[PDB]
Amino acid sequence: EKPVYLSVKADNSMFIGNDPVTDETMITALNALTEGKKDTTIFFRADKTVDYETLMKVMDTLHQAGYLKIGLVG
Amino acid sequence: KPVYLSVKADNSMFIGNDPVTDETMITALNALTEGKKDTTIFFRADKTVDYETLMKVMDTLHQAGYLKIGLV
């Protein structure tokens, strides 16, 4: 199934595809795209300045939701 | 046996307790893994380390064939 791109910007704004998301809404927005298929590949991209704490907060939300196929892009 | 790669806020880097830089990291790692590319590499970093830095390190590991990466 079609991969989803999650983008985090320097302002810490976050997007699933083009949809603005936050930690509390990201899994609902993602499930709209994946129809709950946990084998869908998630590609994470971030502005060069985004820090590791932010990255890990996003990764943990995906992980606790069962989205385990993650690729980092840069 | 897994290896821990640490990146600190000042961008200093370590393989185990061994200081490394991007140009020496793979030699230092091979000394621990004996070249076994299925060895798990755990990446840990200070909260303020930037994504650019993380990706420079990930790319060096990746181009060397170390593909089993866990973020901590």
Partner: peptide
Amino acid sequence: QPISVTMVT
């Protein structure tokens, strides 16, 4: 509690 990642290029 690690997260596994691939890097893509």
